[PDB]
């Protein structure tokens, strides 16, 4: 019911700040500690989020298309994935400076970005149930995050148009029996979490950047807006965590494959198709 994000969760940026002065790395890793979630506001610059926004909303049509459209949970929550060609492929947005420099405090130098896909959530969707995007290593156990999601607003996020419902401290919870094989948190475990630290759901300004632990419990909500509402979304994992490559043209292989912020990569010769992964060498 806020009209902004909170000041526990928050942390004010312009886009030409390229690191965090210690006091403020701190602050954030104590965030993401705590609370599961962390909000960076003014990260991107209006010529990118601007460009993502137009290219999503473009390839929306093709994915609508699709004999059978993929959505998580309920009607509504498409997946669909950004493009990957050279021209949309910004290192603010892949290699941003800031959140490596959060994630590798948080995982491990050698922590790598594996995912580059994206959540079009549509005018009339559905509520998904709470859950885990990514699970606990084992049921009953304490251990620390070994994924961060690295959420990306494309347009303003509001109440009416399906800001995502979060349940902050979350992450670390995992006692016996508490998720599901599809990792949604059992209504007993809701319920008395509801008691201790009720779910929070705010406005993200456009050009914000949202990291949160994988394991934060958090549900899309319905779009009451006339309007599509993307979010790019990326997730760093740490080096041992077993995932399949990022599909990148070559093309960005010079500048990608250098970079001490490690993205899992396997680059294809020509265009890559993201809508339907069709391209012939995978
Ligand atoms: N790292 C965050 C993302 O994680 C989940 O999606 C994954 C999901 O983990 C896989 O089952 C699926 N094969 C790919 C999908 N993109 C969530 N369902 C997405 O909503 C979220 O964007
Ligand atoms: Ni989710």
């Given at each position: 019911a806020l009209a902004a994000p909170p000041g526990e969760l928050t942390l004010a940026l312009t886009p030409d700040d390229k690191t965090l002065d210690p006091a403020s790395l701190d602050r954030a890793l104590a965030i993401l500690a705590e609370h599961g979630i962390l909000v960076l506001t003014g990260m991107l610059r209006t010529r990118l989020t601007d460009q993502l926004r137009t290219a999503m909303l473009d390839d929306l049509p093709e994915v609508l298309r699709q004999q059978d459209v993929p959505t998580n949970f309920?009607?509504?929550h498409v997946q669909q994935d950004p493009p990957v060609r050279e021209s949309l492929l910004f290192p603010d947005v892949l290699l941003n400076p800031v959140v490596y420099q959060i994630t590798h405090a948080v995982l491990g130098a050698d922590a790598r970005n594996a995912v580059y896909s994206g959540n079009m959530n549509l005018p009339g969707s559905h509520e998904q149930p709470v859950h885990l995007d990514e699970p606990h290593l084992w049921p009953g156990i304490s251990h620390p995050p070994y994924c961060l999601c690295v959420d990306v607003p494309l347009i303003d996020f509001t109440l009416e148009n399906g800001s995502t419902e979060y349940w902050p401290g979350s992450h670390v919870l995992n006692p016996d029996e508490c998720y599901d094989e599809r990792g949604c948190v059992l209504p007993a475990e809701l319920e008395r979490r509801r008691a201790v630290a009720p779910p929070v759901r705010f406005p993200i300004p456009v050009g914000s950047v949202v990291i949160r632990d994988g394991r934060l419990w958090h549900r899309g909500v319905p779009n009451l807006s006339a309007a599509p509402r993307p979010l790019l979304a990326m997730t760093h994992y740490t080096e041992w965590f077993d995932m399949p490559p990022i599909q990148l043209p070559?093309?960005?292989?010079?500048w990608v494959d250098g970079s001490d912020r490690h993205t899992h990569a396997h680059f294809v010769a020509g265009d890559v198709d993201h809508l339907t992964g069709d391209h012939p060498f995978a």
């Open positions: 309920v009607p509504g070559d093309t960005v292989k010079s």
